[PDB]
Amino acid sequence: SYYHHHHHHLSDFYDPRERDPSVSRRPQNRQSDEWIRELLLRGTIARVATLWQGEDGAAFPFITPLAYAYRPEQGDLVYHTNVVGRLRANAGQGHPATLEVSEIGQFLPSNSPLELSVQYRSVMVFGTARVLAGEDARAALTTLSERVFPGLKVGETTRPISEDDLKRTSVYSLSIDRWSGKENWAEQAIQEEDWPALGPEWLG
């Protein structure tokens, strides 16, 4: 900055910058519903958090990484998991569930300590998960499998999904209520001009 330069020789914020008019004007890095849909469609791993009763009787969350598929027409995401707790902290046949899908890029170095960061694209989904049965379960497991293994066809590449398979597997539809989408994918973190610049080890 001038003040520092001049001090050596003896704000930023409101001053000119380039802006691409095509960029999102939404606060807090937020993204469009179309962007969220496309991120969900290309992802294959998610974390799901649901609530279980703990030892003190209080609800607490599990976090389970698992394969998933977004089914846009049905308005859900499907996954299977045999991970359970004792009792769900939940009244009813479905349970509230949060699901997260992200694309995490590179860590971004800076000579400014609070500008250290990582590239990310991230979706949070809020809804109700329910266990599927029978041909509902078989269809969801098929969509899932054929999604995460492109080119695989259940019944051809693999034997068909049998009744025994289904008895041994808990398959869920997370029916979507709300979602959120956030991206910060800069190529370089904000740097501090008035401190020695990072060397080529860092940015090269």
Ligand X SMILES: Cc1ncc([N+](=O)[O-])n1CCO
- Per CB under 6 A, the segment of 34-42, 58-66, 85-93, 190-198 that binds ligand X is 58-66
E-strand stretches of the chain: 45-53, 59-67, 69-71, 76-80, 94-108, 117-131, 171-184
Nearer to a copy of itself, 76 or 171 (CB): 171
The SS3 call for residue 195 is coil
Q: What tokens appear for 121 in the block?
A: 């694209």
Answer whether 190's CB lies under 8 Å from 112's CB.
yes
118 binds ligand X (CB under 6 A): yes
Residues found near a copy of itself in the complex (CB under 8 A) = 44-45, 47, 49-51, 58-63, 65, 67, 89, 96, 98-100, 102, 104, 107, 109-114, 116, 118, 120, 122, 124, 126, 141-142, 145, 148-149, 151-152, 154, 157-161, 165, 168-169, 192, 194-195, 198, 201-202
For ligand X, which residue has the nearest CB?
122
Per-residue mark of binding to ligand X, 69-98 (x: CB under 6 A) = ------------x-x---------------
Residue 16 in tokens: 């000119």
Q: Does 145 appear as a known binding residue?
A: yes
Least distance (Å) from ligand X to the CB of residue 8? 34
Burial class (CB in 10 A: 0-12, 13-18, 19+), 188: exposed
Is 89 in a helix, a strand, or coil?
coil
Q: Kindly state the smallest distance separating residue 83's Cβ from ligand X, in Å.
A: 5
Q: Which residues contact 11 (CB under 8 A, 6 or more apart)?
A: none
Contact residues toward ligand X (CB under 6 A) are: 64-67, 81, 83, 102, 118, 120, 122, 182
